Amino acid sequence: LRLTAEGNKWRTDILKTSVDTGREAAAEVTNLDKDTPADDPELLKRLQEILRDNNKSGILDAVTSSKVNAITSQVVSKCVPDGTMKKFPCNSMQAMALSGAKGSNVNVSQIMCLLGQQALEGRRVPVMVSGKTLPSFKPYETDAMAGGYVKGRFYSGIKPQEYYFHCMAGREGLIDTAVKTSRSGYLQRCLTKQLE
Amino acid sequence: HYGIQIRSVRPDQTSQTNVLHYLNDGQVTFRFSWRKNEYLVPVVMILKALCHTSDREIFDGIIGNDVKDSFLTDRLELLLRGFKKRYPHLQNRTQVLQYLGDKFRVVFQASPDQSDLEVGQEVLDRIVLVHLGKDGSQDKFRMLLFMIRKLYSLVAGECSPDNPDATQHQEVLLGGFLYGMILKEKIDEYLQNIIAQVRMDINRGMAINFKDKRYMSRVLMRVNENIGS
Amino acid sequence: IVMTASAAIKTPQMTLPIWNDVSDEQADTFCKSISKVLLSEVIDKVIVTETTARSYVIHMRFFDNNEYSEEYDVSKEELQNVISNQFIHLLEAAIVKEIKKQKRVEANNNMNKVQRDRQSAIISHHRFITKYNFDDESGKWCEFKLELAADTEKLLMVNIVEEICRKSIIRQIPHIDRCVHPEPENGKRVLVTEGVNFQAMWDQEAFIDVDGITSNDVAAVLKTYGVEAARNTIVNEINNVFSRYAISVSFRHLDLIADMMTRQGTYLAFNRQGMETSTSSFMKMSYE
Amino acid sequence: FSIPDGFKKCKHLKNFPLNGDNKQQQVWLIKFPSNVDISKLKSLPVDFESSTTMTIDKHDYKIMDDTDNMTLLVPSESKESLKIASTAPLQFDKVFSVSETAKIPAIDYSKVRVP
Amino acid sequence: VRKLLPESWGFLCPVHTPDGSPCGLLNHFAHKCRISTQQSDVSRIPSILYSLGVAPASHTFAAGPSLCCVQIDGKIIGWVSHEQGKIIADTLRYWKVEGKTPGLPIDLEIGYVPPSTRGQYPGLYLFGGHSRMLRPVRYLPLDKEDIVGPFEQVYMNIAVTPQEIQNNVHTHVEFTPTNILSILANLTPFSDFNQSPRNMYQCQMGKQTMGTPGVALCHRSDNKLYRLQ
Amino acid sequence: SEIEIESVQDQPSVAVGSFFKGFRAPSDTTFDLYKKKKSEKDEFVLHGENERLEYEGYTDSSSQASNQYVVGLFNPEKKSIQLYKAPVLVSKVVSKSSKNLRGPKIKSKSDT
Amino acid sequence: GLLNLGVKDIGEKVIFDGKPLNSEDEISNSGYLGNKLSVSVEQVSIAKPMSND
Amino acid sequence: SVVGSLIFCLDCGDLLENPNAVLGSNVECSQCKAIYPKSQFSNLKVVTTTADDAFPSSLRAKKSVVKTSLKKNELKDGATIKEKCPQCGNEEMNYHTLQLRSADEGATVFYTCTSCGYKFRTNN
Amino acid sequence: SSRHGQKGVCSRKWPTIDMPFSETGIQPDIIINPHAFPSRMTIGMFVESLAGKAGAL
Ligand SMILES: [Zn+2]
Ligand SMILES: [Zn+2]
């Protein structure tokens, strides 16, 4: 489960280019430009305007999620065959994923590289009334991390802020399971009386 | 769909909810659940019943400033004119309570000696904003006028709705606090069984002298008093 | 589809295959000539001054004429005919309805003969409008004065006007809310219509292959095209559900579900109401 | 009148010389908290701006101004009567407010964030 | 209502909730989450707010979102500006954790809601009653423990670790980031490396073990006990 | 930028009425200034009367032990004030006509 | 405590007799109800568990 | 005192009735028998603009100052993982993980290819 | 079950001798399948396994 020190420098340098990603997607949806700084009062006014609308927050989520999924796809596509310490036959974690024995290449990427964007009900991490996604962050923070982008992996650990968003994504996969089977159970019963 | 919901608790941890609805007429109603029913009195009936008010004290308490704010001064005279039109026979405080004690007389189990301005005083001291207690009628008057500039500031969209699920607008009803709430309403049912037992005796004329120590003993050996079970 | 046999689908659509000699600009121009345009979609503000017999000077602010004629293809000669034939009639049908349930910048004047004759005729056609003017030069404002009686009490006029502006249509082909030009999937230049009206799209043969138009409202393919076309829609719409989730089901199952739902020539569900026409009593008793 | 107990009417109503010429006399409505003595203080530092930090007895106060209702009452002649001051109502010329302040300390960032 | 929200930070455990049908409805408290039992002395606070810039509510007669209503326990006591009310909320927190004012209890919460555009209705809301959720954080001037409730927490800036204290935004810091988990969710070894449904599932599997119910088993008589030897 | 003080009048001679906005009270009116005799920050009661109206006020019980107001009289030429420690009276207005009331019960009922 | 603070929110449950006053034919001889009660509780005390027979 | 369309008594502060609803040349309060037999103020105007978010449209959204809609091809998916597409041989593939079952089963990945667009699904 | 949600029934009380034995002679009390961990992502159990053996020594 360990990347080699050559390849572990690779995921640092690509994740070094993600600190600007949150503002640039937020500067794009506000129709500003020129790398206006995050503390711009004419920027923070527009982010509050976006916050009160369910439409405009859907746009800012979709722009910023698809922009940070690129950095997620650059770290994986550079590391997981190449940056690992043990290569394929001896690396049983990959051989369980390549053979189809158990797991996928997504499980191997979240262990070795990073978790990625914690998408909640399709959109992104929810937000308070004050423009704060947690009490740890500045209100109307245009950080990618503040929106729920986990730059940590399960090999090395996830920070307390991004451990809280990952429990949000963990629970929506469990409340949706409890409401899963009751839906399609009655659809099948109802077919098997006519077509019976 | 609009409204202002408050949950007022007494100093004995017993609660009371007073919801403040917005109609599409400029009309605002006051909602409360007394026994298990649910009653709907207009708001300027209460605002004129709590303390001695003019119709400009009600105006200034809502329109503090921004007289030029045209949204507020037009919703409001469908609420001050709507009371003067519908209730022209209610001029001062000691006559709206006569009206308010008359309609609610049956439901609060009022005695035949209580005057209507004593029954209506009890309704205002048992339901509306019970976290300010009795003799805080000025403070109960200023809180409703605050709760109308929250309702009118929400129909205009100057205020997001408060989320009732979001852990800032909710607190924890504890274990023993619930246990003392229910224990109060068992000894309230216990006094009401003493009265319902004596009224059975005065349907007859058997032996009723309320100054007698041995008639009190006969009543209370007939009322079930095992609250502990 | 399967349960309840919804004749009112929540999101009914319609896929319109355009020709191969209609351009992308003439497609996007054709989109704007279909989508409905409320009167609320060309208004910046509505300023209503109530003075007190009673009066109500309703002043409208439209957007600039080079903005709603480009976004909605609406000329200022349309707004004259929309307001003075549809809006003021609907407005007075709400003011009278409320009173019956109650008693239980610049300045422009010196009109010519055209504007004067427009004014006095519409005053005769209506009940209490008494003054009327519309910006004929720039198409930026309308202007009229509802005088009610000298007896009526306070009326929330701005709440009345907002509900009527959002219900007066300038240009609506019926049952059709919006047309859109999506990305061409595998070279299929098509148009997606939020709503179903097959009868209207036949009149648009200069832009549409009308023998290739495709919906997902099965109860509306059934009414227009018949029972075998509706049956072909069911096997295509159950397939679109499973092919989205990359789930392969065989068409032999989907043809037998579809040929059960179309066994009476109608579009019958799997529920009590679809089961009502059957022979077996104990099948029905055991169901619900 | 004077139905509740403890209440005696006022007699020795001292003179309030509201002259009103035209030089001029201005009537003010300044406030004070309970942590100040009126008769001890000599000079009243004031400005049309707010930056008016008055320091009394190891406290720091703040005189706030506001230009943009309350009614003044003055005695009649000698019998009390408290008649309304007017012209021929009457507002105040200036209103102020003295507020107790407190100095929050700056956060010692060189100490409170340890690596 | 099953949705995990950010306002439950430090008050409800994000992990320790049972999988299945009561998922999200049966959430547990955090580690250091105390709940007020008696109400605190707030008879002396209006003497302190009037010493600050609060104009009294009975003379002023103002209303609206353009000013900052000042309420203690749901009793409107005064009115300030929005700029003046922010200074009052900070001084009341400064005099609180510095235990020298003889009227301010530390379990008071100062719920300042700043003005905004179409946000929550502004005001300054003090609470001192029973039943409030409360958790400790470190106030960054004076380096002292502060007590913060969930109405306050939405508008604060509480750093998670002291290494993440940014200049001139953070006023508080957590003592330890493990003050936000439950008791049972905090005993899972290296819980920050597991996947999130697996930390949630241990919290349910940790209840259902056979361990040691107690040592005084020869003086009890239960239906069944499971005892790992 | 200081301003000196002529004198500090501690004795009660000026009161500040707090009526509703837009209050006339015609000029031939007399107001009584009552006073609790306890010699600290004192609780007053106003009362006045004319032929059609009657209206009383009082110092508010919450603030007047904690918040003191002073009416100053300012001279711009001598650059000084003189101070008059005034109370503020939360003042209502009743009418001498609308003090009627109906029967204390329904007075005719024997049905429950 | 909250119990003794809660028994003073219920302090009046009253009834009357149906017996008259038996004076002359007067105006208070027509409106007399009877003699009032006020059954009420002013102190409640939970003791501690003990053993009694 | 004329406040908007409301006129109050300058003695008792009560709401006077509408001067166009009483009979001729007298308005007077119910409590204070007022001294207004005049109907002095003829025009009482109240200019009432509509709310700025009362008419939602696509043209008001362009008159807003932020990006209200996504364009037709100005948001591409960032997710890519090099799995071989079994229909055309493409390597780039947009993945999509949503959690189906309870806390006894992991995540299930949706594989949508880039060029062709064939939907593919891998269970575990 | 371990402390990571890795539960599963005892499939066979496997006899001692035909169970793999270390260099030290130690034979494991519990054999757990490595094919659990790819879909579970319980890496707290790998480092608990690694910190527990450090702590015993
Ligand atoms: Zn009057
Ligand atoms: Zn492909």
DSSP state string for F59-82: E-TTTTTTEEEEEEEEETTTTEEE
Q: Which residues of A touch I38 (CB under 8 A)?
A: 93, 96-97, 102-103, 107-108
Q: Rounded distance, CA C217 to CA E126, Å?
A: 57
Cβ contact E159:E166 at 8 Å: yes
Q: Rounded distance, CA C230 to CA C209, Å?
A: 19
Q: Residue A161: which of E20, E154, E160 has the nearest Cβ? A: E160
- Taking the alpha carbons of A42, A47, A50, A52 in that order, is the dihedral positive or negative? negative
Measured in Å, residue C62 CA sits from the centre of ligand 1 at: 45
Any idea which ligand is nearest the CA of H7? 1
Interface of A with E (CB under 8 A): 45, 48-49, 52, 126-130, 132-136, 138, 154-155, 157-161, 163-164, 166-175, 178
Check contact G-H (3+ Cβ pairs < 8 Å).
Answer: no
B7 CB within 8 Å of a chain E CB? no
What torsion do the CA atoms of A181, A184, A185, A187 make, to the nearest 10 degrees?
Answer: 170
- Find residue E134's DSSP bridge partners: E34
Q: Residue C43: which of H21, H44, H55 has the nearest Cβ? A: H55
Q: Strand C142-145 and strand C132-134: pairing?
A: antiparallel
Residue H96, CA atoms < 13 Å, CB-side half-sphere: 16
Cβ contact E76:E70 at 8 Å: yes
Closest of B158, B159, B138, B144 to residue B28, by C-alpha: B144
Q: Strand F2-9 and strand F80-84: pairing?
A: parallel
Is H53 labeled as ligand-binding? no
Tokens of E180: 């936000």
Residue E137 φ/ψ, nearest 5 degrees: -130, 165
Any idea which ligand is nearest the CA of H29? 1
Tokens of H57: 């449209």
How many other CB atoms sit within 10 Å of the CB of residue C196?
22
I8 CB within 8 Å of a chain E CB? no
Q: Which residues of B touch G36 (CB under 8 A)?
A: 113
Cβ burial A19-39 (10 Å sphere, 16+ → b, else e):
eebbbebbbbbbebeeeeebe
Closest of A32, A30, A120, A114 to residue A70, by C-alpha: A114
Cβ contact A113:A119 at 8 Å: no
Any idea which ligand is nearest the CA of H116? 2
The one-letter amino acid at F75: N
Return the residue in H2, H6, H48 with the most chain C beta carbons within 10 A, the one to mutate for interface testing.
H48
Measured in Å, residue H9 CA sits from the centre of ligand 1 at: 5
Q: Rounded distance, CA A142 to CA A19, Å?
A: 9
Instruction: Report how far apart the first and last C-alpha atoms of chain E are (Å, whole number).
Output: 42
Q: Resolution for this model in angstroms, one decimal place?
A: 3.0
H82 contacts A104? CB cut-off 8 A: no
- E-strand stretches of B39-188: 39-42
Q: Rounded distance, CA E15 to CA C286, Å?
A: 44
DSSP characters for E178-219? GGSS-SGGGSSTTTTTB-HHHHHHHHHHTTTS-----S-GGG
Return the residue in F18, F23, F50 with the most chain H beta carbons within 10 A, the one to mutate for interface testing.
F23
The one-letter amino acid at B180: G
Helix A54-79 / helix A41-52 crossing angle, nearest 10 deg: 110
Which residue from G minimizes the CA distance to B209?
A: G17
DSSP characters for E10-33? TTB-SS-S-SSTTTTTS--B-TT-
For residue D106, give every residue at least 6 positions away whose Cβ sits within 8 Å of its Cβ, in sequence order, or none. Answer: E141
In Å, how far is E14's CA from the nearest CA of chain D? 27
Cβ contact A133:A148 at 8 Å: yes
Cβ burial B52-80 (10 Å sphere, 16+ → b, else e):
ebbbbbbbbbbbbeeeeebbbbbbbbbbb
Cβ contact A187:C241 at 8 Å: no
Any idea which ligand is nearest the CA of H111? 2
CB-based contacts of C258-262 (< 8 A; 24+ apart in sequence): C258/C231, C258/C234, C259/C231, C260/A194, C260/A195, C261/C2, C261/C5, C261/C231, C261/C234, C262/C227, C262/C228, C262/C230, C262/C231, C262/C234
Tokens of E25: 């409805």
How many residues in total does chain A contain? Answer: 196
Which residue from H minimizes the CA distance to E205?
A: H103
For residue B191, give every residue at least 6 positions away whose Cβ sits within 8 Å of its Cβ, in sequence order, or none. Answer: G10, G13, G39, G40, G41
Q: Where do we find the tokens 């008649």?
A: D83
The one-letter amino acid at B37: N
Helix A54-79 / helix A21-29 crossing angle, nearest 10 deg: 150
In Å, how far is F37's CA from the nearest CA of chain H? 32
G2 contacts B180? CB cut-off 8 A: yes
Is H12 labeled as ligand-binding? yes
B187 CB within 8 Å of a chain G CB? yes
3-state SS, chain C, equals: CCCCCCCCCCCCCEEEEECCCCCHHHHHHHHHCCCCEEHHHCEEEEEEEECCCCCCEEEEEECCHHHHHHHCCCCHHHHHHHHHHHHHHHHHHHHHHHHHCCCCCCCCCCCCHHHHHHHHHHHHHCCCCCCEEECCCCCCCEEEECCCCCCCCCCCHHHHHHHHHCCCEEECCCCEEEEECCCCECCECEEEEEECCHHHHHHHCCCECCCCCEECCHHHHHHHCCHHHHHHHHHHHHHHHHHHCCCCCCHHHHHHHHHHHCCCCCCCCCCHHHHCCCCCHHHHHCCC
Q: Strand E158-159 and strand E172-173: pairing?
A: parallel
Give the determination technique. cryo-EM
DSSP H63: S
In Å, how far is F67's CA from the nearest CA of chain E? 6
Q: Rounded distance, CA C4 to CA C180, Å?
A: 29
Q: Please give the interface size between B and F, counted as residue pairs whose CB atoms are below 8 Å apart.
A: 35
Cβ burial E7-24 (10 Å sphere, 16+ → b, else e):
bbbbbbbbbbbbbeeebb
Is H85 labeled as ligand-binding? yes
Q: Rounded distance, CA D103 to CA C35, Å?
A: 63
Q: Rounded distance, CA E27 to CA A87, Å?
A: 44
CB-based contacts of H64-67 (< 8 A; 24+ apart in sequence): H64/A49, H65/A30, H65/A31, H65/A46, H65/A49, H66/A29, H66/A30, H66/A31, H66/A46, H66/A49, H66/A50, H66/A56, H67/A28, H67/A29, H67/A30, H67/A31, H67/A59
F10 contacts D71? CB cut-off 8 A: no
How many other CB atoms sit within 10 Å of the CB of residue I29?
6
- Taking the alpha carbons of C174, C175, C177, C181 in that order, is the dihedral positive or negative? negative
Q: Rounded distance, CA B145 to CA B61, Å?
A: 6
Tokens of A164: 């809280």
The one-letter amino acid at D50: S
Cβ contact H89:H115 at 8 Å: no
The one-letter amino acid at B229: S
Residue H120 φ/ψ, nearest 5 degrees: -135, 150
Residue C101 φ/ψ, nearest 5 degrees: -90, 25
In Å, how far is I34's CA from the nearest CA of chain E? 15
The one-letter amino acid at E174: E
DSSP characters for E48-66? HHTTTTPEEHHHH---STT
Is H51 labeled as ligand-binding? no
Closest of D43, D25, D94, D96 to residue F4, by C-alpha: D43
I38 contacts A108? CB cut-off 8 A: yes
Q: Rounded distance, CA D64 to CA E82, Å?
A: 14
The one-letter amino acid at A128: M
Cβ contact D103:D60 at 8 Å: yes
Q: Rounded distance, CA A156 to CA A154, Å?
A: 6
Return the residue in A52, A128, A129 with the most chain B beta carbons within 10 A, the one to mutate for interface testing.
A129
Is H113 labeled as ligand-binding? yes
Cβ contact C144:C131 at 8 Å: yes
How many other CB atoms sit within 10 Å of the CB of residue E116?
21
Q: Rounded distance, CA A50 to CA C89, Å?
A: 38
B26 CB within 8 Å of a chain C CB? yes
G47 CB within 8 Å of a chain B CB? no
State the alpha helices, DSSP H only, in G1-53: none
Q: Where do we find the tokens 């066994």?
A: C263
In Å, how far is E46's CA from the nearest CA of chain F? 8
Q: Where do we find the tokens 């009735």?
A: H17
In Å, how far is A101's CA from the nearest CA of chain I? 8
Q: Rounded distance, CA I46 to CA A155, Å?
A: 10
A187 CB within 8 Å of a chain C CB? yes
Is H120 labeled as ligand-binding? no
Cβ contact A27:A36 at 8 Å: yes
I7 contacts E189? CB cut-off 8 A: no
H-helix or E-strand spanning residue B199? helix B175-201
Fold (topology level) of E38-129: Hypothetical Protein Ta0175; Chain: A, domain 2 (3.90.1070)
Cβ contact H119:C244 at 8 Å: yes
Cβ contact B9:B131 at 8 Å: yes
Maximum Cα–Cα distance across chain B: 72
Cβ contact B47:B30 at 8 Å: no
Closest of H90, H80, C183, C182 to residue A66, by C-alpha: H80
How far apart, in Å, are the Cα atoms of E187 and each of E15, E31, E182, H52, I6? 12, 11, 9, 54, 16
A97 contacts I38? CB cut-off 8 A: yes
Chains that touch A (3 or more CB pairs under 8 A): B, C, E, H, I
Check contact A-F (3+ Cβ pairs < 8 Å).
Answer: no
Measured in Å, residue H16 CA sits from the centre of ligand 1 at: 7
H103 contacts I39? CB cut-off 8 A: no
Q: Rounded distance, CA I19 to CA C150, Å?
A: 103
Give the CATH number of domain A1-159: 1.10.132.30
Coil, helix or strand at residue H5: coil
Cβ contact B54:F93 at 8 Å: yes
What torsion do the CA atoms of A129, E87, F63, E65 make, to the nearest 10 degrees?
Answer: -40
Burial level of E101, CB count in 10 A (0-12/13-18/19+)?
A: middle
How many other CB atoms sit within 10 Å of the CB of residue C279?
6
Measured in Å, residue B86 CA sits from the centre of ligand 1 at: 19
Burial level of A52, CB count in 10 A (0-12/13-18/19+)?
A: middle
B117 CB within 8 Å of a chain F CB? yes
B27 CB within 8 Å of a chain C CB? no
A154 contacts E17? CB cut-off 8 A: no
Tokens of E225: 């006990």
Any idea which ligand is nearest the CA of H9? 1
The one-letter amino acid at C270: F
What torsion do the CA atoms of E80, E81, E86, E89 make, to the nearest 10 degrees?
Answer: 0
Q: Which residues of C touch A191 (CB under 8 A)?
A: 2, 257, 270
For residue G19, give every residue at least 6 positions away whose Cβ sits within 8 Å of its Cβ, in sequence order, or none. Answer: G34, G35
Tokens of C200: 């209207």
Q: Where do we find the tokens 């449950």?
A: G13
Chains that touch D (3 or more CB pairs under 8 A): E, F
Q: Rounded distance, CA I27 to CA I25, Å?
A: 6
Measured in Å, residue C243 CA sits from the centre of ligand 2 at: 15
- E-strand stretches of chain B: 3-9, 15-22, 28-32, 39-42
